[model samples]
Structures are given as C-alpha cells and as structure tokens.
Target: SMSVKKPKRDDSKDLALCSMILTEMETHEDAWPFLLPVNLKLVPGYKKVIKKPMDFSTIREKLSSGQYPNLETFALDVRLVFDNCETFNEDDSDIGRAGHNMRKYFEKKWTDTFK
Candidate 1:
C-alpha cells in the first residue's frame, strides 16, 4: 500500500520570519523600486503603482492572526519576487540578490531564534 507523508509545520517560526521580513523592508528605502512590485503583486491593485515606504503594523497584525501559515511557502513567495523581476538580467541582479540574501537571513534567524 502506498502512503502519504505529512509536512512538518512551524507556525510561530513562520510568523516570526514574516514579521522580520516586513520589518526589515520597512527600513530599506533604496530597495523599494525592485521590491515593491514584487510585494504589490501579492495584492490586488494598480499595475503601475509607484513604490512607497512600507508599514509594519498591518504586516504584524496579519502575522499575528496566522495569515502566513507556511515557511516553505513563504520562502517561495520571497523567491517569486526575484522571479517576477525578470528584467534584472542575471542571477546576480542587485535587487534579486538582495531578495535572495534576505530570505537566507530570515532562514538563519529562524534557526538561531528558535534554537
């Protein structure tokens, strides 16, 4: 008989990472041009919307309410930011690399904070 395996879950860790990412973005004004569109894509709105500063309160509220449920899925969402920035020209695109680096930073932070 074939069997299915369930994925391990970490709700608190995911929330923490989500909070951290949103909080980090709050301070990086220079990253807005590349990062904003990636974020706005997740929401329904104007396609040509100009980048603006981020507010963490709403993000924290969402995280606290269990809006982001999975770490791997969230990681993929982060990666998709890079994917959507196809005009970046290479794997080392500044904004794309920054997004990649930030994801790794949060992953490391998760291990350190949780351990």
Candidate 2:
C-alpha cells in the first residue's frame, strides 16, 4: 500500500520567500520574460502580459496565491527558469549572469528559510 507523507517545511515562509525572489527579479528588466512565460495568457491575469514592460504587481499577486502546492515544487519551478537561462544564453552574457545570480539568491534564501 502507498502512504502519503506530510510536508515538514512551513508553506507560509516558503511562499513568502518565493514572492521575495520574484520581487527581486522584477527589478531586472531582462529577467521579466522568465516571470511571464510564453502562453501565460492562458492564466487569467496574464492575458495582457508583455515582455518589454513587466507588470510586477500582477506577477507577485499570482505567486503570492500559492502557485505551487509546496515549497519543494516551487523551488524546482524557479530553478528551471534559471536553468533555461543558463542553457540558452552564454554564461557571461548579462541575462545569463543575472539568471545565475538569481539562482544563487534563491538557494541561499531557501537554506536560510528552511534552516
């Protein structure tokens, strides 16, 4: 028989950290695309989303609503965004470096929040 395991981490704090990282990404124009991915219009509020002029408030609201079910899933999604950056752009490129830095920031925050 399969058993369900309860999560050990605090979702409230994890969600808060996720929101904070997204807030930081908003400051960097190049990182905006990662926040508003292609076909994001399928999501209710993302209908008018654009890459050039990012609307952080909407993004933050969506994230704050518990986009991912758990902290581990949330972290994985965030990691994938940066990983895509590292995959597509040159490591030394502005966007690439920004992605790397963001990943580092996320990892640090995750450790601090969980520990």
Candidate 3:
C-alpha cells in the first residue's frame, strides 16, 4: 500500500512568501491594491505571516514577481482578495454578472469588444 504524509509547516518559508508580496507592492505602487475591494490582511494565515512590518514587504515582492512556485502558496495569497466575493455560478455575484454580460456582448455583438 502507498502512504501519504502531510507537509510540515515551516515558519521561515511562510514568512518568505508573505514578504515577497510586500516587496513587490512597495516597488510597484501602480499595482498597489492588486485586488480591489479586498484587503490583504483578510487572507488565510495572514496574522502569523504579517505580524510585523518586516513580513509585509516580502509578501509584496513575491506576489508581484509571480514567483510563487506552488498552487498552495498562490491560493493562500489570492484567496485574501477573492474570498466571499461570489462565484460565477450565480447571477448575483460580481464575477458572474461580468461573465454574463461579456458573453452576451460577444454573442450578440462583436467579440473584440471584450478586448
């Protein structure tokens, strides 16, 4: 039989990811608030990773660089901005409405309008 083991939690690694995003944000003010209507502080595990100012800068750098090598890391950071925002399966969701309208535009009008 095959055995599976859970990955160990490493504080240093977690902090590194968080710090990268912060650095990127500092360097690229234009992308400041990469996510609208969402706060970085709301991400899962944010408390532990961003307990201090030092941790924040690193996260910014990592995120902006697109250097997150795994989905777990990517999800953690992205979720902060996308959580509870609604899914495309429903018309009431922001993303769903955008998708519905975009679909309608392309179907009834020009596909290039989305571009």
Candidate 4:
C-alpha cells in the first residue's frame, strides 16, 4: 500500500486561496474592529502595547499588492490580527469576544479549505 502523500505544487507566489480566505473573514459578523487598523489618534497608547499591529484592511491591501509569498505568510498576518486583538481586549469584553469568534471562524474556514 502506498502511504506517501503527494506533493502539492508550490503556491508560494499566488494567493488565490488565501485571498478567498481573507474575503470570507471580512464578511464574518464579528469583523468590525478587525476591519481596519487601530486608530492611534483614538487610542494614543495602542502602539505602545501592540507593537506589531495588524488588521483586515491592511492584510487585504497586502494581499492585493502581492506581498504574501505563500499561504503561510498570509496566515501570519491573519493570526497576528487576532493576537493583537486578544492582547488589547479582555476575553469577556465585546471586542474581545469578537476576536475569539473571528479567530474561531477563521480557523474553521481554514480547515474547510484543506478539507
């Protein structure tokens, strides 16, 4: 019995699948805070806490610009956005819950792609 896994072709430069993933994330109901970057003007100390800031709009622009070399690179920003969210907001808070929901949905959709 052949148990070896077939090697998938390199998708490093093209973000077709990840692009679809990004779009679906934006459409999620709990994607408000994640829709855009944190407003430094509003939260003057945001940068002080969240050193590596990430958001949906920024990730979208990066994807549109072909910045991501692979799905792995794309996933980094996706995860970072939520990590920043959880770092900034408490789990019991509204935005915090949204972060958890979005993270769960993203991972669910992520598995869906592989499945």
Candidate 5:
C-alpha cells in the first residue's frame, strides 16, 4: 500500500529524497539545480492574472539572457507553470500522470481568487 505518506518520509537509503523538497524547493532562490534555458515565445493575447504576482517580462529576459533565477523561485514557477501545466501531469499515477490541466486550472484559480 503506497500511500502519499509512505513516500513522503522515506528516508532510509542513506540519501533521503524527501529532504530535497524542503531543503531545496521551499524558497524563491533555490531551484537552479535542474534547468536549462531554451528559447520561449509568448502567444498573443495570453493573459490571465494569478493571485501571486509574477513578472513575465523579467522571467523572459532572464531566459533570453540564458540565466535562470535563484533556485526557489525557479522551482515554484517551474512546478506551477510548466510542470503543472496542461501538457504536463498533475497526478503521478499513470505513465504521464495527467493532473489538473494547468492552463485551465491556473486561469480558473487566478480569476476566482484575484479577479
């Protein structure tokens, strides 16, 4: 029975995986270990506000400049925008673990909470 809690605290292989999430992923400048910048283009008229403000131009500049921001913010946005986005998966149960289609999810959440 592999419930969420089982993997959440599995720290017995001399190198605990759970520690990485807290020690690395919980801040705004701690997510540089797992990224490579590539060219990005924003589609026309694609704007939906989020409750947490994000500077898209700033991020785009950073990406264009081939520099990733600090690890934490990187992780949070990566998870929120790219990883959790519709093309990716929210649930991790299947081959691709399709989660809550993020574009729609993000849009709805953003509007419901902020707009």
Candidate 6:
C-alpha cells in the first residue's frame, strides 16, 4: 500500500545522485568503521544493543541491488549510522568524532544535492 506512493519513473536521477553520494562516503576518511558491517566477533554487544545496524556497503546493496523508492528512506539510512555511532561511541572519542563529521558531511551533501 505505502509502497505504491513511490512514483515510478525511467529518470531515476536520484540513482545517479546516490552514486555520487556514496562515492563521497566511500573515500571519506571517517568512513572506515561504517564502511562495512560491524564485526560481531570483533565488536561484542553490538548485536545486543543495535537492533538495526546500517553500513555503507549494506546501504549500497539496498540502493544498487533493490528498490530505492526515494531519498527519504535512504537519507535516514545514512543518518542511522551517526545515531548508531552516538549510541556506541562517545562524542569526545576518536570514533565519535569521525561519525560526527561523517554525519555532517552527508547532511550538507543532501542540501547541495537537493537544495
């Protein structure tokens, strides 16, 4: 029902936009931790606390391989990383700062991309 709201069009310009968007995320300095799924073996309690874990690769898979209805859901998927980071890493810590900057980076990116 809700899925029908996403108007289908041949010109999925946002798909191209996402290409560039993810390109930035790929080369980002702070993207290391979030570039891939968190290692459950390496980072314990991650599974216990984080209900829905998101990463660039996973998001890309969804964006590239499946139906990317709109930027709204994708945008939140991007934001999910920052919130996850904040939940696990402190603001003053290195990983936290990385996530913060990464978060800000994409926020402004959307503005430039859409605004």
Q: Over 4 Å off in model 6, which ranges?
A: 1-11
Write candidate 2's Cα lDDT for 1-115 as tens digits.
Answer: 2687776544556667767766666665566556655455454433343323223354465567756676666666666667656655688887788778777776786677676
Give me the displacement of residue 24 in model 4, in angstroms. 1.0
Best candidate (score: lDDT): 6
Q: What residue runs in model 4 are displaced by over 4 Å at the alpha carbon?
A: 1-14
Candidate 6 accuracy as lDDT: 0.87
What lDDT does candidate 6 reach at residue 22? Answer: 86
Candidate 6 lDDT tens digits, 1-115: 8666676555558888987898898798888989999998788899999989999999988998755678788888999988999999988999999999998899899899887
Pairs clashing within candidate 4: 12-69
lDDT for each residue of candidate 3 in 1-115, tens digit (9 for 90 to 100):
2587678554445445444433443354333333233345666544454432222234455655867765357535544332322231356755545444433432332222111
Provide the TM-score for each candidate, comma-separated. Answer: 0.44, 0.58, 0.25, 0.87, 0.22, 0.87
lDDT (0 to 1) per candidate: 0.51, 0.62, 0.41, 0.87, 0.35, 0.87
Candidate 1 per-residue lDDT over residues 40-88, each given as its tens digit: 5664542454333222344455456766566655555444443454333
Clashes of each: 0, 0, 20, 1, 10, 0
TM-score of 4: 0.87
Any runs in candidate 2 off by more than 4 Å, and if so which? 1-13, 28-33, 38-67
> lDDT tens digits, residues 1-115, model 5?
5554543532243122222322333232323322223223352222332333333343444444546444334335534544423333235634132223333443453345334
Q: After superposing candidate 1, which stretches have Cα over 4 Å from the reference? A: 1-10, 38-67, 86-115
lDDT of 5 at 40: 33
Ranking by lDDT: 6, 4, 2, 1, 3, 5
